[PDB]
Design a binder for these strands. Structure first.
Length: 224
RNA sequence: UCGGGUUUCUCUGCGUAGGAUAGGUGGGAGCCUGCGAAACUGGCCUUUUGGGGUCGGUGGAGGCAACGGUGAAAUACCAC
């Protein structure tokens, strides 16, 4: 079991907001190693339509407890600008062979301006149906693979949505403070309640709950 | 007896590849001795291709997820 001294401090009948929960959230965690805590939401608009699936990014403020993933595919004076910085598996068009021979655990498979045709003529029968490619309106097109890859650097990207009514983007790590468990939670209601395409319902924010490596749940209030 | 809601206790969920229904994000590798995992024979909830729970004879007690296998995402340990 080992449920006590962590569920006892918890009542699913009260509320712990933005400046009271983030200081009683690293608590609700006393398990083994490091212990991050989730932050739940509910896009329960009309979840069985293809015009209520969130297909947009999030950009965490500070630095998480990770690094950066951007599988660049460049050539020339674009090789010493993505290898001498902090990207991932950077080189030339050899990356086609590194993203077609069985290794697609990468993220933004970047490219060069004149060399989108390399990701478009060979890996359009492969990478085509991934939607993980550099578009001229998405995030990383042109010669902005240094400062808008700093949107894949200065922000753990990711983008997903489901079919029941549960949506919960995480904060990052509890390796911070209580003004940084709610300053990374100031990038969750600052990057997930911009999801109203064309049809909606009444009242989006219904409540809020929690999650760790041993729970439980003190309902996060919503307001000022 | 019919109406529905709430709340607790309970489970289905193979259009695709995956040995074997993966149901989601984080702590994604450890503790678990404090709340429904193997598949022989006249089974129901899913409907006589295989798959959790089986009434009874039959009676090796420690383990797995995984690297691999593999999809925009994987099959277990705590949970919304």
């Amino acid at each position: 079991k080992r449920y006590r001294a962590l569920e006892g401090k918890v009542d699913r009948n009260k509320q712990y907001s933005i400046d009271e929960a983030a200081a009683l959230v690293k608590e609700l965690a006393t398990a083994k190693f490091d212990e991050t805590v989730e932050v739940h939401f509910r896009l329960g608009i009309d979840p069985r339509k293809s015009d209520q699936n969130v297909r947009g990014t999030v950009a965490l403020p500070h630095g998480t407890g990770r690094s950066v993933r951007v599988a660049v595919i460049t050539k020339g004076e674009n090789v010493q600008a993505a290898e001498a910085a902090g990207a991932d598996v950077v080189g030339s068009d050899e990356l086609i062979e590194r993203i077609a021979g069985g290794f697609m655990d990468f993220d933004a498979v970047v490219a060069t301006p004149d060399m989108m045709a390399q990701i478009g003529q060979k890996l359009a029968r492969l990478l085509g149906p991934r939607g993980l490619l550099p578009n001229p309106k998405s995030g990383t097109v042109g010669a902005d693979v240094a400062g808008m890859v700093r949107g894949l650097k200065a922000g753990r990207i990711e983008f997903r949505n489901d079919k029941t009514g549960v949506v919960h983007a995480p904060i990052g790590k509890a390796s911070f403070e209580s003004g940084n468990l709610s300053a990374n939670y100031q990038a969750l209601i600052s990057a997930l309640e911009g999801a109203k395409p064309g049809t909606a319902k009444g009242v989006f924010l219904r409540s809020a709950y929690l999650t760790t490596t041993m729970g439980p749940s003190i309902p996060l209030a919503l307001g000022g």
